[PDB]
């Protein structure tokens, strides 16, 4: 019931601020804290008592509060600051609780652009013998970390039986994702071909497979 922008994008060396808006019974009346959650990790306290830093938090991070709002500031932004940021405070209402903002996803665009490498596998004869058919679209080495995937049976869009993962960061700091098209062996054999189309920063890469 605290309000933050859901997402912010910035570049290394920039300054960013993230705002948190509440009411008189939470922020207006209580101290604000800010929590950093790096991907795959637990939240960590960044700022408490509106503007105080725990030991070990660089002074690039600052906070302020006025009225029913609070602000987190980050100067000299680094790629390592890419994280979800949560404001938190106490709500003093008679049924009391800790209250958080919904979180701001801070994306730091700090690597070279990289188009996705796409590999599309047809169903194996082993899986066909098991009376199933799966097309496997593997998408790797792209940056920034967002793609959209569309599938085509011959030339028409197919949306049933599609499952696509969120992008995940690779060791080399590029991103990877997967998409799967589930078909029956009859569907697989009855069409001329199937296609996986990966769109990244408005450019489309496509792979196609066909029954044997």
């Amino acid at each position: 019931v605290l309000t933050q922008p859901p997402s912010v994008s910035a570049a290394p060396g920039q300054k960013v601020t993230i705002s948190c808006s509440g009411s008189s019974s939470n922020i207006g009346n209580n101290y604000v804290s800010w929590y950093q959650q790096l991907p795959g990790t637990a939240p960590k306290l960044l700022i408490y008592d509106n503007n105080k830093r725990p030991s070990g938090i660089p002074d690039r991070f600052s906070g302020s509060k006025s009225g029913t709002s609070a602000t987190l500031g980050i100067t000299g932004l680094q790629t390592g600051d890419e994280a979800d940021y949560y404001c938190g405070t106490w709500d003093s209402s008679l049924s009391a609780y800790v209250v958080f903002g919904g979180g701001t996803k801070l994306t730091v665009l700090g690597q070279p652009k990289a188009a996705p490498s796409v590999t599309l596998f047809p169903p194996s004869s082993e899986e066909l013998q098991a009376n199933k058919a799966t097309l496997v679209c593997l998408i790797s080495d792209f940056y920034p970390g967002a793609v959209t995937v569309a599938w085509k049976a011959d030339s028409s869009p197919v949306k049933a039986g599609v499952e696509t993962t969120t992008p995940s960061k690779q060791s080399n700091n590029k991103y990877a994702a997967s998409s799967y098209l589930s078909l029956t062996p009859e569907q697989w054999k009855s069409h001329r071909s199937y296609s996986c189309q990966v769109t990244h920063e408005g450019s489309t890469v496509e792979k196609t497979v066909a029954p044997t």
Binding site: A42, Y97, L120, T134, L138, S168, S178
Partner: protein, 221 residues
């Protein structure tokens, strides 16, 4: 100095209950308030409740009242969160956090690493492993992609290695997808010199510890 150590991942069916623990290792809970905060996949932080053992007090968010119970054992410096009548919507990571004092209104300066809780009607099941054979359509620039499709298992996790760990570079194991059936699938690829395809053996080693299943599968052209 203090570290909050939480119990391991849990997998539960709808209607059951889960109890998660959080031990103050190298420290104590005696002087402090302790909260439980959860985070559903891709979602935000949600406070469930907290306990202040020194004042014999516990507090809960109205969303979870009647369903969540928080307790402490001071002989072992261990806090507990029990959530009953589980739904699939209760799938989340559950964090223990210690406050900077004995007030829940104080900041949360120490956090545990989280306990994953998965609620699903699915039953434990080992995967089928299908080979993703190298071909012209997966070969370019003198290197070929080949892989293993690890299909229809429950629950997470699965690990994949190649040639029993001897083959690591060029290996890419993708995060899993969840199908409408309730079962997961993932894939693992390795890119190799195309010229090596007739002479080197490529075997993926799939380990699914929740079902005590291991599969070794050679992948060939």
């Amino acid at each position: 100095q203090v570290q909050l150590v939480q119990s391991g991942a849990e997998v539960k069916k709808p209607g059951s209950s889960v109890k998660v623990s959080c031990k103050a290792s190298g420290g104590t809970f005696s002087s402090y308030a302790i909260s439980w905060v959860r985070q559903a996949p891709g979602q935000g932080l949600e406070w469930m409740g907290g306990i202040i053992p020194i004042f014999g007090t516990a507090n809960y968010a109205q969303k979870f009242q009647g369903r969540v119970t928080i307790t402490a054992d001071e002989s072992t410096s261990t806090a507990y969160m029990e959530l009953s009548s589980l739904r699939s919507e209760d799938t989340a990571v559950y964090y223990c956090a210690r406050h900077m004092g004995y007030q829940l209104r104080e900041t949360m300066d120490v956090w545990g690493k989280g306990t994953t809780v998965t609620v699903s009607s699915a039953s434990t099941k080992g995967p089928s492993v299908f080979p993703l054979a190298p071909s012209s359509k997966s070969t370019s620039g003198g290197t070929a992609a080949l892989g293993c499709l690890v299909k229809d298992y429950f629950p997470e996790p699965v690990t994949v290695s190649w040639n029993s760990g001897a083959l690591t570079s060029g290996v890419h194991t993708f995060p899993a997808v969840l199908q409408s059936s309730g079962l997961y699938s993932l894939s693992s690829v390795v890119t190799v010199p195309s010229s090596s395809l007739g002479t080197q053996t490529y075997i993926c080693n799939v380990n699914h510890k929740p079902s005590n299943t291991k599969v070794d599968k050679r992948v060939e052209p």
